[PDB]
Amino acid sequence: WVLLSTVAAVVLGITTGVLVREHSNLSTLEKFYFAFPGEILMRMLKLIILPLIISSMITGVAALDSNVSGKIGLRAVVYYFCTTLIAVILGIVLVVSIKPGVTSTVDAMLDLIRNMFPENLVQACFQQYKTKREEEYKIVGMYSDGINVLGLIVFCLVFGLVIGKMGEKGQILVDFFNALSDATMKIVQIIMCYMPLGILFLIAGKIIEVEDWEIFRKLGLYMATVLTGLAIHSIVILPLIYFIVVRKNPFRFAMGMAQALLTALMISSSSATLPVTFRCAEENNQVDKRITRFVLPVGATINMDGTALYEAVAAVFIAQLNDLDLGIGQIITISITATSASIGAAGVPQAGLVTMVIVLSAVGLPAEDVTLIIAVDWLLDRFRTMVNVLGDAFGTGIVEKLSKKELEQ
Numbered sequence: 202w203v204l205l206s207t208v209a210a211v212v213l214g215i216t217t218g219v220l221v222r223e224h225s226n227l228s229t230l231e232k233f234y235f236a237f238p239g240e241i242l243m244r245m246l247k248l249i250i251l252p253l254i255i256s257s258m259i260t261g262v263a264a265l266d267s268n269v270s271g272k273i274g275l276r277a278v279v280y281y282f283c284t285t286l287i288a289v290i291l292g293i294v295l296v297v298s299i300k301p302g303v304t305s306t307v308d309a310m311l312d313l314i315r316n317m318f319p320e321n322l323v324q325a326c327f328q329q330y331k332t333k334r335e336e337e338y339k340i341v342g343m344y345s346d347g348i349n350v351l352g353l354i355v356f357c358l359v360f361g362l363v364i365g366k367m368g369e370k371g372q373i374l375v376d377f378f379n380a381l382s383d384a385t386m387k388i389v390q391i392i393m394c395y396m397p398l399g400i401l402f403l404i405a406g407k408i409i410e411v412e413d414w415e416i417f418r419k420l421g422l423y424m425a426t427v428l429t430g431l432a433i434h435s436i437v438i439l440p441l442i443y444f445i446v447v448r449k450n451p452f453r454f455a456m457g458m459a460q461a462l463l464t465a466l467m468i469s470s471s472s473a474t475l476p477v478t479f480r481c482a483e484e485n486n487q488v489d490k491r492i493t494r495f496v497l498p499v500g501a502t503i504n505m506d507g508t509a510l511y512e513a514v515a516a517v518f519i520a521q522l523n524d525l526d527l528g529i530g531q532i533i534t535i536s537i538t539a540t541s542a543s544i545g546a547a548g549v550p551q552a553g554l555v556t557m558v559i560v561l562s563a564v565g566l567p568a569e570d571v572t573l574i575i576a577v578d579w580l581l582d583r584f585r586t587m588v589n590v591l592g593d594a595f596g597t598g599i600v601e602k603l604s605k606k607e608l609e610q
């Protein structure tokens with residue numbers, strides 16, 4: 202129902218936008234009031250960011266076992282790091298080169314580490330740290346507004362690891378944040394019931410307020426940038442990584458995952474596609490069962506190739522829309538924030554939307570600019586999930602080749 206409701210809201214929002222745009226002259230004040238239901242939806246999404254990322258980040262980390270630290274688990278983590286790193290570079294290169302929404306670096310990277318360790322946990326919920334050179338030059342910090350997602354994610358990772366390893370002493374903390382994570386999921390579900398009506402006025406409000414259709418061509422280039430990045434990752438990069446490690450034709454392996462790929466094109470969830478991925482990887486591709494049960498669940502949470510090519514590209518596209526010429530330091534900040542946002546909004550309905558709201562809030566871009574992403578979020582998220590499933594499927598074969606000796610004992 203979520204897909205049809207979101208699609209209908211976009212269709213109805215466009216229909217409402219063009220009818221109100223022509224059949225009625227609206228002043229600047231009335232246009233702002235017309236988008237109030239959409240504005241209220243954005244407030245709910247920002248409201249749930251803080252409890253969602255904190256509880257989800259603690260809950261996922263606190264349940265980690267010793268298998269992740271094993272040789273099989275370490276190889277999977279290294280593989281997902283390398284493919285995500287390639288996807289991060291590929292997404293940055295494409296959005297910088299194509300420049301879809303268009304017409305110091307040391308301090309930006311140092312600010313990334315500074316925000317990675319906030320000076321106050323409560324302030325990190327609504328403030329971020331920035332440094333600017335002053336005049337022979339000195340550095341001055343400001344602590345501007347904006348939720349510090351990187352600081353919260355880092356602390357919740359360390360906090361989750363600590364409470365996971367202290368056994369029954371920290372079991373109450375694991376239980377507390379498990380229930381809090383479940384409660385936040387239900388509240389997100391309640392918000393998604395209002396999302397279609399909010400999307401209708403967000404889309405219609407955006408159609409009314411625009412004066413020229415040049416932004417639509419910019420949206421078309423944004424689709425090309427996201428689709429081009431996924432196409433290169435799925436057809437060029439991932440098959441090449443598979444072949445060099447396994448020395449076997451990756452297209453027969455991809456053909457074996459055909460049923461899992463189609464299931465990804467409808468369910469649009471890597472976790473929900475796991476049962477199909479497990480069967481296709483195990484019997485069709487003859488990948489060992491002992492390794493699929495480890496690599497695939499690991500990829501269901503830390504496979505950020507799709508996020509790098511979809512959410513980070515979208516965030517940079519929004520930055521280019523606001524006439525912001527961000528540099529290498531700022532672009533890297535967006536990409537790292539996007540992956541941190543994704544791990545925070547993992548098992549969430551409309552994760553693509555929720556992740557985008559987290560990234561825009563944590564970067565400074567207007568979260569109301571996400572309406573252009575929403576109009577195609579249903580389409581682009583389906584392909585993003587398909588690439589993530591293909592990436593996880595290739596990982597099982599890649600990890601298996603490197604684990605031949607371990608599987609022999």
Ligand SMILES: COCC(CCO[C@H]1CC[C@@]2(C)C(=CC[C@H]3[C@@H]4C[C@@H]5O[C@]6(CC[C@@H](C)CO6)[C@@H](C)[C@@H]5[C@@]4(C)CC[C@@H]32)C1)COC
Nearest residue numbers: 261262269278354358495498499501502503537540541544
């Ligand atoms: C469904 O269950 C899944 C489970 C296994 C899951 O294990 C994973 C849990 C998350 C965890 C700890 C894992 C690997 C990379 C970890 C990330 C490295 C990234 O580094 C950072 C910081 C530095 C940045 C450059 C990039 O991002 C962090 C935000 C990111 C990070 C700390 C987020 C948490 C990730 C292991 C299956 O087990 C059977």
Ligand SMILES: CC(C)CCC[C@@H](C)[C@H]1CC[C@H]2[C@@H]3CC=C4C[C@@H](O)CC[C@]4(C)[C@H]3CC[C@]12C
Nearest residue numbers: 262265266267268269270271274278282358362
């Ligand atoms: C250089 C940049 C990318 C930061 C590098 C940080 C890497 C090396 C760190 C960040 C958090 C760490 C992970 C956090 C927790 C666990 C659970 C543990 O039971 C097995 C290892 C594992 C999975 C860690 C492996 C190393 C890790 C991924």
Ligand SMILES: CC(C)CCC[C@@H](C)[C@H]1CC[C@H]2[C@@H]3CC=C4C[C@@H](O)CC[C@]4(C)[C@H]3CC[C@]12C
Nearest residue numbers: 317355356358359360361362363364365366367
């Ligand atoms: C560089 C960024 C990503 C932060 C990573 C910081 C690393 C150094 C931190 C993150 C979480 C930390 C772990 C969290 C909890 C424990 C349990 C403790 O009884 C032994 C050490 C151990 C396993 C920590 C080692 C250091 C650790 C891995």
Ligand SMILES: Cc1ccccc1Nc1c(-c2ccco2)nc2c(Br)cccn12
Nearest residue numbers: 278281282285286503536537540541544
């Ligand atoms: C799997 C892994 C292990 C160790 C360090 C990083 C990663 N993976 C990863 C993540 C990520 C995973 C979850 C949230 O973020 N983001 C990035 C970026 Br940007 C660039 C490069 C890698 N990356």
